[PDB]
């Protein structure tokens with residue numbers, strides 16, 4: 605055990621004690637690869653694995669084919685995708701039970717319970733991309749995953765078009781997706797715009813790319829070489845291995861800050877080490893030191909001691925180009941409560957969905 609001070613998820617702590625090996629033991633599965641002799645026609649490349657849009661030959665429905673180049677990780681991705689899509693009664697559709705939600709009973713962790721929370725059933729399960737098939741090329745034998753197709757527009761093209769209310773709408777959809785996967789005992793670990801497909805005309809959002817996702821097990825020390833540099837939480841950068849779902853809320857917050865302040869990426873590190881320095885230059889060294897002390901973290905071998913930086917208030921990122929998005933107190937408070945060094949302090953997905961910034965979206969739900 606690397607960690608000196610141990611940490612547990614504030615919410616959804618015991619999902620993978622509630623659920624058994626049949627649910628989370630991906631090592632002990634055997635993949636039934638289906639040779640693609642007649643099922644899927646590959647058309648054009650949509651991104652990059654290498655990812656193609658194709659067609660189901662029977663129904664003529666568009667699908668996505670993700671060509672894989674990592675055997676254990678493939679089994680994990682498949683188990684996660686199937687666990688998420690196959691759950692008959694998603695937990696997030698049932699009536700809210702606060703005592704089954706706030707499951708970590710440290711006194712110091714209960715102070716982070718917010719006075720607001722979204723306490724209603726929701727359809728976040730429907731925002732998880734669906735895996736349709738597991739195939740091999742009939743000639744090359746290369747393995748691939750077949751998915752639901754989304755008519756996406758790249759975030760760099762789409763996001764500048766979105767109004768304040770539209771950003772609120774889609775970020776609420778993303779939180780619903782994260783609340784669902786967390787309720788299922790899964791951390792996405794690579795939340796970023798490239799992994800969020802949006803079909804704007806249909807107001808459709810799907811969280812994709814579950815290849816870094818992992819099952820949350822209490823006091824497990826995880827690999828910190830996950831996420832993507834610009835969205836990596838401080839826990840990854842300082843090698844605090846006993847992290848949880850709250851990693852995804854950091855990534856969410858970074859994505860949100862980028863959208864609201866029109867600064868992409870928001871924390872633009874030139875290296876792994878510099879990524880942390882870029883975060884500290886905003887959140888400040890004082891709270892950084894308090895965080896290292898709380899968990900008794902020693903920085904990884906690449907790091908000199910952190911220099912002293914005074915916190916940069918969020919309002920300093922406001923300009924005439926972004927004030928239509930950043931010029932209210934609610935968004936600043938939301939961002940501030942997501943981008944915290946201490947993962948325990950961050951809003952959970954339900955708490956974030958309850959935040960005042962989402963009031964206009966919540967008011968339109970009931971029909």
Ligand SMILES: Nc1nc2c(ncn2[C@@H]2O[C@H](COP(=O)(O)OP(=O)(O)NP(=O)(O)O)[C@@H](O)[C@H]2O)c(=O)[nH]1
Pocket residue numbers: 650651652653654655668670752753754755756757794798799801812813814815
């Ligand atoms: N139009 C469209 N594009 C898609 C769809 N699914 C994936 N893509 C494109 O293909 C890219 C890569 O898919 P992804 O599953 O993230 O593959 P990955 O290799 O695991 N990427 P990462 O480096 O983030 O781990 C996406 O960023 C996206 O641009 C889709 O349903 N529709």
Ligand SMILES: [Mg+2]
Pocket residue numbers: 798799813
């Ligand atoms: Mg991706």
